[PDB]
């Protein structure tokens, strides 16, 4: 039975990694950041409410100009909003209305969407014709597209419910790289600020760190007790926060290879649908199933504030690149910009 | 507002308009979530009605049905089954000639999937149009093979009527919260030609009963 030898070897390696993490766990982040001045209570008010979606909003993504944001809803519409004025720049009709992810290209020339059709569709926002057209349909995933993120105009990484992420070449349409290793359904992605590598959370309660260019997994972070619905790097790219169904957000550090802090409250039982970081990284903003976003002090595990105002599960949220505003989409079909 | 900002507001308002027509057109759409076990006969159900998930559209007696077949989604239902929360009815396809077969028992797999879907938290008021496919192959197999292979506690005659009634009861008692939802069981093999009629009847029943619940009369 060579499998027993391999299983025992894997258990030995897991114990080795656990002991290595414990060795570096000299002092918890909570201990270190007791002396730092806590932010008392931030009062963010809904500045804009984006109305026009007629079904549950499953994904929003901010433009790099911090003004345009794309949102995906089950009514089969991908809408690009001018959040400053609330104007709808584009309303993109999707071939499959079962979209559960949307990404807005950093250049702003494209949006991606995907979902139960197992296809990440790339839309050309800036066409010579005045319409937005599907520039590229990235087929190759055998599960639902749970997340997608543009590396650039031509490279896009897409997580899927087939337990594998994939890096795509949009012009060719082919999977440049496939990121296997997740046992559960991959539910989120977060690109690093340098875009050299990305994390991905799956239903196996494990967040894996993937090098984009070579295509293999640096690290695996296992601290969650339920499916990971949301993941986001710290702004410096040396840490990331996850959002799981167990009403817990965790901050994992890339270099320390270990969980640093847990953002949990006994009064929160619903799972997290989306997480995002403020520009300085001090605020962790987590959407919840209890219909409201809770803002956490990322360094003290203190709930600095709550963005109540959604009448259904807050399914997605994002902080602008300049950090001015937070837009929270939700299942009540309304996007709210907070500030 | 500048002149171009005024034209941008006008564009946003036109987009709002077209969103309104699209949403009103999609409101007149009867959404049906088609489930089953792939080899449970859902494909011939679609054939009678006429990767990723397959959206099937058919019109019957002025009702326009959208039937979303998600059997090809081998991924976790728990992450995308809430997308069909506002679905009118669930069309569950079960092959009757799967009581003896194995993937565990195929009929037991169908029953556990049916239990999960029926008592799902997203489908408390979503009635289920249960389809029991392959009734003629069930004829042939129940003439020779006994139903006790699937149900040890059956203790009944191995004729089509008793066996089919027991199977339907075993599916319909998996339905907790019987107050908020019904199950519309039907029997078909491959040529029934009234499966779309049964779905229409079940959907109109669902609609009428929701309207009755609105008035306080159900």
């Amino acid at each position, epitope marked *: 039975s060579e499998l027993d030898q391999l299983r025992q070897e894997a258990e030995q390696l897991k114990n080795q990694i656990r002991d290595a993490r414990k060795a570096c766990a000299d002092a918890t982040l909570s201990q270190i950041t007791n002396n730092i001045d806590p932010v008392g209570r931030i009062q963010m008010r809904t500045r804009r409410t984006l109305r026009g979606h007629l079904a549950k909003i499953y994904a929003m993504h901010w433009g790099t100009d911090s003004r*345009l944001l794309v949102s995906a809803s089950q009514d089969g519409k991908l809408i690009i909003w*001018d959040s400053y004025t609330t104007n709808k720049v584009h309303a993109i009709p999707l071939r499959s209305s079962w979209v559960m992810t949307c990404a807005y290209a950093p250049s702003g020339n494209y949006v991606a969407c995907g979902g139960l059709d197992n296809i990440c569709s790339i839309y050309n926002l800036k066409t*010579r*014709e005045g319409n937005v057209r599907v520039s590229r349909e990235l087929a190759g995933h055998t599960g639902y597209l749970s997340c997608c993120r543009f590396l650039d105009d031509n490279q896009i990484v897409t997580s899927s419910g087939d337990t594998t992420c994939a890096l795509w070449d949009i012009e060719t349409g082919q999977q440049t790289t496939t990121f296997t290793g997740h046992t559960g359904d991959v539910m989120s992605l977060s690109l690093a600020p340098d875009t050299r590598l990305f994390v991905s959370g799956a239903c196996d309660a494990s967040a894996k760190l993937w090098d984009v260019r070579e295509g293999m997994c640096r690290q695996t972070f296992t601290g969650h007790e339920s499916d990971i619905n949301a993941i986001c790097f710290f702004p410096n790219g040396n840490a990331f926060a996850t959002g799981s169904d167990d009403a817990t957000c965790r901050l994992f550090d890339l270099r320390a290879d270990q969980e640093l802090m847990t953002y949990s409250h006994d009064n929160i039982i619903c799972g997290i649908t989306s997480v995002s970081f403020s520009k300085s990284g001090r605020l962790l903003l987590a959407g919840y199933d209890d219909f409201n976003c809770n803002v956490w002090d990322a360094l003290k595990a203190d709930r600095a504030g709550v963005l109540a105002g959604h009448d259904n599960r807050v399914s997605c949220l994002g902080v602008t690149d300049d950090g001015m505003a937070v837009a929270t989409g939700s299942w009540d079909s309304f996007l709210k910009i907070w500030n | 507002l*500048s002149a*171009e900002d005024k034209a*941008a507001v*006008e564009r946003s*308002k*036109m987009i709002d308009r077209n969103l309104r027509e699209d949403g009103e057109k999609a409101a007149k759409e009867v959404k049906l979530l088609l489930l089953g076990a792939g080899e449970s006969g859902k494909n011939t159900i679609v054939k009678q009605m006429k990767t990723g998930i397959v959206e099937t559209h058919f019109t019957f007696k002025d009702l326009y049905f959208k039937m979303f077949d998600v059997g090809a989604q081998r991924s976790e239902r728990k992450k995308w089954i809430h997308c069909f929360e506002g679905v009118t009815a669930i069309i569950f396809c079960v092959a009757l000639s799967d009581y003896d077969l194995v993937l565990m028992n195929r009929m037991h797999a169908s029953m556990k999937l049916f239990d999960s879907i029926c008592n799902n938290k997203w489908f408390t008021e979503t009635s289920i149009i249960l389809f029991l496919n392959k009734k003629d192959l069930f004829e042939e197999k129940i003439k020779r093979s006994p139903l006790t292979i699937c149900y040890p506690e059956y203790t009944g005659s191995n004729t089509y009527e008793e066996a089919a009634a027991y199977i339907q009861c075993q599916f319909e008692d998996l339905n907790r919260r019987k107050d908020t939802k019904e199950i519309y069981t039907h029997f078909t093999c491959s040529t029934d030609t009234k499966n779309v009629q049964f779905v229409f009847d079940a959907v109109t029943d669902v609609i009428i009963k929701n309207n009755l619940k609105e008035c306080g009369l159900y």
Partner: single-chain antibody
Amino acid sequence: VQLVESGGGLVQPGGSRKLSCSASGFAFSSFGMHWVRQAPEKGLEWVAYISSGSGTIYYADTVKGRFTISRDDPKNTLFLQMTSLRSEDTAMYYCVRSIYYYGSSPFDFWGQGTTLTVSSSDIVMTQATSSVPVTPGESVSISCRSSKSLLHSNGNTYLYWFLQRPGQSPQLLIYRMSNLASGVPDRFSGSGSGTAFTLTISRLEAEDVGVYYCMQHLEYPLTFGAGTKLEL
């Protein structure tokens, strides 16, 4: 993407004409089309504007009530109903497509135009310099003057730069001051503030020869500057 104009020709004064714009190759229904006319030896002058969906319509104060604009969205055709054609209506009539959302590029495409020969508070764009002589490969800057601050409180400066190449319809170069249009080489650049604007060409070629027009988009009398010609 192409716009083809129809109609035009010798018309007796006091008569009436319909100009047809057979748009083809783009989502015509989503564009707010314009008519911009140019006298046989003068600059551009904006005639009328019909928005996307025909909901909003403007006319030049010199033709308001006297011209009528309309679009056939199913047929992708833009119309200009003209009545009582005075002698001053003798102009090349350009159909211009223009789409207005955040970051859009209005006036990006222009139709070829139709010759039209009639028988015998506005912001003032000023191009004081005209007929600038220049050598290929040498930089040149074209000054633009505005009678009112084109910079809006939203942050956008609505100054457009067009290039009337000889024998060609205009071609958007800079749409909102310091914004290169699509298909324009990154040697043109727009600069300015408030009322004064400069279009600096880095290293021009034999293709940059032509007449460069200002245009304000702050209000809807769309006024053009008296074109600053460039010649070798």
